[PDB]
Amino acid sequence: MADPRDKALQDYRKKLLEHKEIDGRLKELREQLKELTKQYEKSENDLKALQSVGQIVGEVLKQLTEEKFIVKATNGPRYVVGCRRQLDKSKLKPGTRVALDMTTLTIMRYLPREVDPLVYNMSHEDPGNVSYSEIGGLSEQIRELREVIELPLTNPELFQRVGIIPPKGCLLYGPPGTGKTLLARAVASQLDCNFLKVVSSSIVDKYIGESARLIREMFNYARDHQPCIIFMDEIDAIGGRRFSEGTSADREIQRTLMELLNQMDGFDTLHRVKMIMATNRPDTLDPALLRPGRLDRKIHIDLPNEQARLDILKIHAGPITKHGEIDYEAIVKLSDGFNGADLRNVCTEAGMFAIRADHDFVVQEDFMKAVRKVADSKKLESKLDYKPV
Amino acid sequence: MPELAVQKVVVHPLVLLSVVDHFNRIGKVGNQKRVVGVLLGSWQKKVLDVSNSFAVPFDEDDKDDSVWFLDHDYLENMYGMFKKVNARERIVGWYHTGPKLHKNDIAINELMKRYCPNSVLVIIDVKPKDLGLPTEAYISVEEVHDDGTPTSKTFEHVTSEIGAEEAEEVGVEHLLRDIKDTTVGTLSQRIT
Amino acid sequence: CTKIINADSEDPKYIINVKQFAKFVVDLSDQVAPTDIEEGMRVGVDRN
Amino acid sequence: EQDGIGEEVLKMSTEEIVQRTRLLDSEIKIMKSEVLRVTHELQAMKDKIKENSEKIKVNKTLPYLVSNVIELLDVDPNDQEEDGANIDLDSQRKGKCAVIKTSTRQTYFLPVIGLVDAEKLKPGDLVGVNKDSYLILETLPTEYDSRVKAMEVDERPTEQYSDIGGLDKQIQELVEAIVLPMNHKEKFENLGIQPPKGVLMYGPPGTGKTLLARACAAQTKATFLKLAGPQLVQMFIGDGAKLVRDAFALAKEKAPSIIFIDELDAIGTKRFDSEKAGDREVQRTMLELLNQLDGFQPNTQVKVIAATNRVDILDPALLRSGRLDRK
Amino acid sequence: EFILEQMRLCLAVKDYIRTQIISKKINTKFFQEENTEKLKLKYYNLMIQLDQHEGSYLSICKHYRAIYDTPCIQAESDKWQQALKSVVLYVILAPFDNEQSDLVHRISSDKKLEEIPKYKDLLKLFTTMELMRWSTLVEDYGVELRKGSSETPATDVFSSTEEGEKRWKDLKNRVVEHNIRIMAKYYTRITMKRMAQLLDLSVDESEAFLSNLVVNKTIFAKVDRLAGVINFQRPKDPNNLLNDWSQKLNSLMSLVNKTTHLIAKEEMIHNLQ
Amino acid sequence: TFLEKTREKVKSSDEAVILCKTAIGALKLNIGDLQATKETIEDVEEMLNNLPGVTSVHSRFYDLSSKYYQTIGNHASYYKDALRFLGCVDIKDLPVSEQQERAFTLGLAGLLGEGVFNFGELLMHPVLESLRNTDRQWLIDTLYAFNSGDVDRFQTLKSAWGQQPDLAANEAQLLRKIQLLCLMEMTFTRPANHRQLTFEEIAKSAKITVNKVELLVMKALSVGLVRGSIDEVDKRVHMTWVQPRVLDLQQIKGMKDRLELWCTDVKSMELLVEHQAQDILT
Structure with a gap:
């Protein structure tokens, strides 16, 4: 190269x-061999999966002793099973899912408590929230709610000093479109914890008393994963009355209703789970359900007031790009007739x-058009969710 | 290579019977020349379940204990077949037919370790040793003694017991033409 | 045959409803036409 | 490699390097013999694997049941919690495993395939499972019934807008409202608005309320879901309600898409209080619909067309904006 | 800041109790942070005087120790000598029970503790179970504990400050009761008289220590005023002797059968030798 | 620097890699880089240990780690490290001189300790035992006294101790320690039938007052040489248990005696057990 000695070295x-090129050949053959070992482990573990069946899942109905456990198997017939000694019997105890064998009928192992796929759809959903207030200036009523639901659940210590019986639950009623559902999102927004926003138009089932039992499984789940506030939506059919001189649906609503009563207060008290219920028509529910002393606050949310309408526009004005106008404020205040959902719709x-x-x-012309249109449409269908005023 | 996946060694009645039966089959050797064979059994467990054993033709001389024959080729070929039987059957270690261990056994152990992932040398005896265990299990260990001995490779004992499997256990009762005055279930058995 | 879904990887996939009311996905007939297996069509499938 | 460095000069003599060259000639030939050995080792390992492969092959093919994933446990490939005893480890021990709730209405905790692990499959998948001994061979797309098939995308024909003359103004509102936020979501965001949660077309029968929507949608090319309100109601109690929830979920995956709902007195009954009727089941399908429109995002992307020839049975919430933005 | 201001003004008039409860309600996490560090120092320094008067021993150990850990004190050589030794002194002062024993382990673990030879030696007697004499402990106590420290020229607040003397007296009760604890477990029986020779304190003083000790329930004792015997861990039932007798025989059988397995390997010979 | 340079490649397989590592450890120690010596010593110690084939190499390395402990002058730590050398010992490829210095220092070192006892081990190895000098004749007789567990033999030797001032400073500690050992030594050796000891025995032997022995016995139990309870009013310390001890001269003899008593009883007893209960015996 650069030295006369490096030239000798080069030859x-x-x-x-x-010598390396000859080694290369050997090396190719090893390369396939390194992959072949990973696949070997994978397939050997795969044979063990192939001989092994999809063993019966079950639940512990009653543990009499270590050696005799009664199980409710998922195939149907309840069985007497044994246990292996490589397990702690404390974990396996009743109301808990356990694996069962199918080769011998013995409890295989401990499985953690389990929740349905229906509950997953309900646990996932929450977004579309608002920061704090549904409408500003009304904010005092909102705080009261917050005071009720958030605090006792997080920290009971403050309630203990005072010596008082803590606040329990909220029932929401007000006109359709006021923003009851948005409030439910609003409390969630600020806090950012585990949430179960439980739609009650999928708890329901063709069999009777399966839907009641189901709601109960969600309450248990919320307790494990505290903090949680459970938003109950559309309780104009999971809460009702006795009914039952008709369909199979009618026996079903009364049963599901029984569960909401217990949770509010009837042996179970709100401290571990908290509920706010958003309801369209409060006269659908039970005379028991309404009754105060298993509810603290019964909040009535009011529609927008003159000064209350302005602030909501102010939050809407940031998202929308305009020519450099801010014109919306004055025009809305002189006109009349908005509910919260309609106000966001004039802007949309x-x-x-x-x-x-x-x-x-x-x-400025677009906005005008919207105010006329929205008022017009109300007139056709003035058949809104009936509350006497 | 690891000798790891053992804290206990349980051995089936199948293991013993296979060695006496196999002696006739091979050549009618009869512990004239000691035999080493593969020890087969389970893996991916802390406890070692020796499900099975097959003989490999190994003759070690009685002129000399440093000379032996050990048939390597049989081991690789028998390897693929074990999976046809079950996928819990892999080579765990090796067996010595006794009457006793040797120093020579360290050398026999290095060859067998290449195949196994958890090599152990378990002496299954062709003669049952007493009314006790006819098996003793040992594992190769690098240790010093304060006797003024530097580093040695020797065999230190690991606890041996006899176990059984659900299929096998039933089959044993049927085969048996003894009734058991040594059952140890009750007062009558207990006094014996 | 209840529904036609393709994610084909052998021969065309169909989901059928068995009369024990377990859903199973089966594949294109052993020799018969794909034009004979349709949505809302009856099919004979092996028991074993 | 080692040579052709200046350091080599210092360390060694020239004579050492030439002698090293002479040794190299013999060394290469030996390495060539070694080629034959390596190939030989590779085949032996493979043979064990080949034995294993025979078993995997049959399970993978037919028959296979259809199931859903309830939950994910996992426990690694035959490592477990050390539940292995002196009972079999081909009939007790499971590989990396997934809990599945099957469509039969049973549950099975099952050992999934060692090659493609349980970790990959998440809750919510619709999977095949082996009937004999349960393994998840592969994944199957969204598959259910013939009712669900219509809901899945495939265009609905044009009946043309040049079948109705006049009422021009009204045509412009439909084409802007439904078709544009679907493709052009970027523009709806750019201006500053959310894409609609739907449009309600109302009026007297026969005007062409449905006529324009179906016609315009094909022509433009759109992703068309065919939903019918009375279909969604069923004779089983609140099963019907679940279907709505699932049907919208189907639209959310596919997103952005337009869900055409033909008629809205069957998921738009007026009633929120009733007894002694088939209207009890009908009210629940209607209530689940109100929830799906409410904000959880990817469901502002997806659009909704609903039609009525009446107003004396329209549901006021669905008419009201924030369920269906446009009227 | 709020607690800091309030604590100082109420300190001057002397009202320890009202602020002191409040300081615990504010979460311990806030004080530790770097941003708060400058306030933390001031806050604790006040608080340690306050709790001292109250006589909450357990609280001083914690407060001084929180101080010890904070970055500026750790980093500088001088600062930790006073703060950590202060914890070491409050830990001996704390109620003689399980809490005391748990805190002595914590301090002894500290690497910083171990470098001082004096304090290392001092902990080493408490840590042992070997019988440790009051006479020896006292000369060792003179140099280290009374001034606070002896490995830097500073006074740590523990003894020789107005509150400091108050605590020192108790320190005598704690150490003697500890000497008794270690001793009590080994000796089933001791005469009152022999115990005095062992403690290097009179029979009357030992009697009073045991009265306090049995109440804390560190170890149970029966003590007589007759002077006959002090009995530790004896019920005076035959039941004890019957169960104990059985346990020794039960282990023994197990031992013989395991030993012989290894013996079998030795026995073979001409392969070892 | 040169030692490291040589460490490059290998012909086939030759153990040469480790030798260079041990040699860098030896070099570090002389120079005065103690910290460095230490890290390399830890790495080699594993590599050597694994093979059964290393006899000699592992032993020189072990001597090297003992040299680092000795330089500090902390005797307790020195004695322990030295023990690993005693197990690994061999005279071959280990210079006569390094061994000689180490063995004399060690002998002194164990005695100075507060709670280390392996005297029985020392008798077993020729490295300390065969090594003899003027000073060394008395020092081995003191180790022997210790091994048997006799307070009185040990203490009579006291005049000789003074030749070493190290022994003279902690003479007090040394006499107390023999006695602490005696509790363990006497109970395992002389009684098969009993296991209790009186205080008075210790007392005379030590020629130390009665008041002290009760206190010494308490320290003995705390170290774990013996476990048991002390009953003051009966004037006994009863041993439930005796600590294992490395092979001693007295010991081996007692074990045999007790095994003989044991064989004989088991044969007598076997006849009684068999003789009665005839109808279940089959």
Whole structure:
């Protein structure tokens, strides 16, 4: 190369390089061999999966002693099973899922408590939230709710000093569109914990008393994973009355209703799980359910007031791109007739008019159009969710 | 290589019977020339279940204990077949047919360790040793003694017991033409 | 045959409803036409 | 490699390097013999594997049951919690395992395939499982019934907008409202608005309320779900309600998409209080619908067309915005 | 800041109790942080005086120790000598029971503790079970504990401060009761008289220590005023002797059968030799 | 620097890698880099240990670690490390001189300790035993006295001790320690039939007052040489248990005697057990 000695070295080097090419051949064959071992372990473990069946899952009905456990198997017939000694009997105790064998009928192992796929859909959902207030200035009523639900659950210590009986639950009623469901999201927004937003139009089942038992499984789940606030949605059919001189649906609503009563207070008291119920029509529910002393606050949410309408526009105005206007405020205040859901819709529907014209901007003319349109549509269907005023 | 996956060694009645039966089959050797064979059994467990054994033709001389024959080729080929039988059957270690261990056994152990992932040398005896265990299990250990001995490779004992499997246990009763005055279930048995 | 779903990896997949009311996915007939297995069509499938 | 460095000069003589070259000639030939050995070792390992493969092959093919994933346990490939005794480890020990709740209405805790592990399958999948001994061979897409098939995307024909003359203004509102936020979601965001949660078309029968929507949607090319309100109601109690929830979920995956709902007195009954009727089941399908429109995002992407020829049985919430933005 | 201000003004008038409860309600986490560090120092320094007067021993150990850990005190050589030794002194002062024994382990673990030879030696008697004399302990106590420290030229607040003397007296009761604890478990029976020779304190003083000890329930004793005997761990039932007798025989059988397995290997010979 | 340089490649398989590592440890120790010596000593110690083939190499390395402990002057730590050398000992490939210095220092070192006892082990190895000098003749007789567990033999030797001042400073500690050992030694050796000891025996032997022995006996139990209870009013310390001890001269003899008593009883007893209960005996 750069030394006359490096030139001599270079002729020798070729032979060292040659020796590596012969090793290369050997090396290819090893390369496949390194992969072949990973696949070996995988397949050997796979044979053990193939001879092994999909063993019966069960639950412990009653543990009499270590050697005799009664199980409710998922195939149907309840069995007497044994246990292996490589397990602690404390884990396996009743109300807990356990694995069962199918080769021998013995409890294989401990499985943690389990929840249905239905409960997963309900646990996932929450977003679309608002920061704190449904509507600003009304904020005092909102705080009261917060005071009821959040605090005792997180920290009981404050309630202990005072010596008082803690606040329990909230029942929400108000007109359709006011923002009852949004409040449910709102409390969730700030806190950021485990949530079960439980739709009650999927707890229901064709069999009777399976739906009641189900709701109960969700309450248990919320306790394990505290903090939790359970938002009950659409209880105009999971809460009702006795009924039952008709369909198979009618026996079913009364049963599901029984569960909501116990949880509110009838042997189980709200401290470990807290519930806010958002209801369309409060006269659907039970005369028992309403009764105060298993509910603390019964909050009535009011529709927008004159000054209350302005602040909501102010939050909407940030998302929307306009020419550099802020015109919405004055026009809404003189007019009348909005509920919370309609106010966000004047801003959404002005945005639609702009898009037809082609603008990324919303003009003062668009907004005007929306106010007339929304009022017009109310007139056709003034058949809103009946509450006497 | 690891000798790890053992804290206990249980051995089936099958293991013993296979060695006496196999002696006739091979050559009618009869412990004239000691035999070493593969010890087969389970893995992925702390406890070692020796399910099975097969003989390998190994003759060790009685002129000399440093010379032996051990048929290597049989081991690789028998390997693929074990999976046809069950996928819990793999080579755990080796067996010595006794009457006793040797120093020579360390050398026999190094060859067998390449195949196994948990090699152990378990002496299953062709003669039953007393009314006690006819098996003793040992594992190769590097240790010093304060006797003024530097590093040795020797055999230190690990606890041996006799176990059984559900299929096998039933089969044993049927085969048996003894009734058992040594059952040890009750007062009558207990006094004996 | 209840429904036609393709994620084919052998021969065309169909989900059938057995009369023990377990759903099973089966595949294109052993020799008969794919044009004879349709949605809302009856099919004979092996018991074993 | 080692040579052709300046360090080599210092360390060694020239004579050492030439002598090393002479040794190399013999060394390469030996390495060539070694080629034959390596190939030989590779085949022996493979043979064990080949034995194993025969077993995997049959299970993978037919028959296979259809099931859902309840939960994920996992316990690694035959490591477990050391539950292995002197009872079999091919009939007790499981590999990396998944808990599944099957469609029969049983549960099985099962050993999944060692090659493609249990960790990969998450809760919510619709999977095949082996009938004999349970293993999850592979995954199957969303598969259920013939009612569910219609809901899955495949365009619905054009009946043309040039079948109705006049009422021009109304046509412009439908094409803007439904078709544009679906493709052009970027623009709805750019302006600053959420894409609708739907449009309600109301009026007297025969005007062409349905006529325009179906016609325009094919022409533009769209991802078309065919949902019918009376279909969603069923004779089993609140099973019907679950279907709505699932049907919308189907739209959310596919997103953005337009769900055409033909008619809305069967998931738009007016009633929130009733007794002694088939209206009890009908009310629940309607209530689940209200919830699906409410905000949880990817469900502002997906659009909704609902139609009525009446107003004297329309559900006020669904008419009200924030369920269906446009009227 | 709030607790800091309030604690100082109430300290001047002398009202320890009202602030002291409040300080615990505020979570312990807040004080530890670097941002708060400057306040933390001030806050604790006040608090340690406050709790001292109250006589809450357990609380001083914690407070001084929180101080010890904080980054500036650890980093600088001087600062930790006073803070950690203060914990070491409060830990001996704390009620003689299980809490005391648990705290002595914690301090002794500290690497910083171990480098001082004096204090290392001092812990080593408490840590042992070998019988440790009051006479020896006292000369060792003179140099180390009374001034606070002896490995830096500073006074640590423990003894020779206005509250400090108050605590020192108790220190005598703690050490003697500890000497008794270690001793009590080994000796089933001792005469009152012999115990005095062992403690290097009179029979009357030992009697009073045991009265306090039995109440804490560190070890049960029966003590007589007759002077006959002090009995530790004896019920005076034949039941004890019957169960004890059985246990020794039960282990023994097990031993013989295991030993012979290894023996079998030795026995073979001409392969070892 | 040079030692490290040589460590490169290998012909086939030759053990040469480790030798260079041990040699760098030896070099470190002389120079005065103690810390460095230590880290390399830890690495080699594993590599050597694994093979059965290393006799000699492992032993020089072990001597090297004992040298580091000795330089500090902390005797307790020194004695322990030295023990690993005593097990590994061999005279071959180990210089006569390094061994000689180490053995004399060690002999002194164990005695100085507060709670280390392996005197029986020392008798067993020729490295300390065969090694003899003027000073060494008395020092081995003191180790022997210790091994048997006799307070009185040990203490009579006291005049000789003074030749070493080390022994003279902690003479007090040394006499108490023999006695502490005696509790363990006497109970395992002389009584098969009993296991209790009086205080008075210790007292005369030690020629130490009665008041002290009760206190010494308490320390004995705390170390764990003996476990049991002490009953003051009966003037006995009863041993439930005796600590295992490394092979001693007195010991081996007692074990044989007790095994003989045991064989004989088991044969007599076997006849009684068999003789009665005839109808169940089959």
